[PDB]
């Protein structure tokens, strides 16, 4: 009977942090979490050192060492970390479907835009940062107009090599 965090919303929300939207194709890949803390749901991941592991640290990704994919919302995750994949757990990375993610940009994004990754934190945006600290995920595009700090769905394809931007 818990009425806390009641906002009396006009209508239903759109999605959650890492939920997918149904479509026939999806590469979902099982990896093992390597970071000491968990990994959030809609997040980018790099290639681990365990030959099948992944890390949440993408500060050193390059066109030669591209990022691995994006985690998905699992909803059965050990109930000790709130919404995360705990250490030593199947990660369920996705690299082909359409997924809801979080926007980090001042002016927001619109339907068809490039997707730029900020290597410092691992956040998605519309344009390059400008100090050799951003990559462009070459095969990727948005699918929703959204403001700053809101959820937008994007279409992703990680087999296309990334592009470095200074």
């Amino acid at each position: 009977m818990a009425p806390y965090n009641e906002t009396y919303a006009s209508d239903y929300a759109f999605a959650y942090e890492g939920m997918v939207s149904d479509i026939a194709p999806a590469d979902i890949i099982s990896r093992t979490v390597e970071t000491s803390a968990g990994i959030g749901f809609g997040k980018i991941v790099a290639q681990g050192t365990s030959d099948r592991g992944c890390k949440a640290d993408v500060s050193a990704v390059s066109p030669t060492a591209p990022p691995l994919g994006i985690t998905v919302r699992s909803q059965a995750t050990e109930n000790l970390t709130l919404d995360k994949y705990p250490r030593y757990d199947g990660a369920a990375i996705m690299r082909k479907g359409v997924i809801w993610v979080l926007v980090t940009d001042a002016g927001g994004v619109v339907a068809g835009d490039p997707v730029w990754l900020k290597k410092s934190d691992g956040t998605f945006s519309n344009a390059d940062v400008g100090s050799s600290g951003g990559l462009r995920l070459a095969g990727c595009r948005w699918d929703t107009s959204a403001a700053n700090g809101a959820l937008a769905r994007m279409r992703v394809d990680f087999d296309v090599p990334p592009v470095a931007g200074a």
């Binding site: 093992t32 365990s50 099948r52 592991g53 250490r87 030593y88 757990d89």
Partner: protein
Amino acid sequence: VNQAIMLGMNLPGEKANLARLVYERMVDRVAFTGDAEKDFKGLFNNGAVTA
């Protein structure tokens, strides 16, 4: 599978024997040593006993 059926081979049932066998292999490897993917410390390398 249809070429193996007219030879009396039973491909679906011949792929289950070896799958059980490799399952037992996996259980053995987990029991007697570790994976370092789930931190399943084994009997031969547990770091909490005195050496």
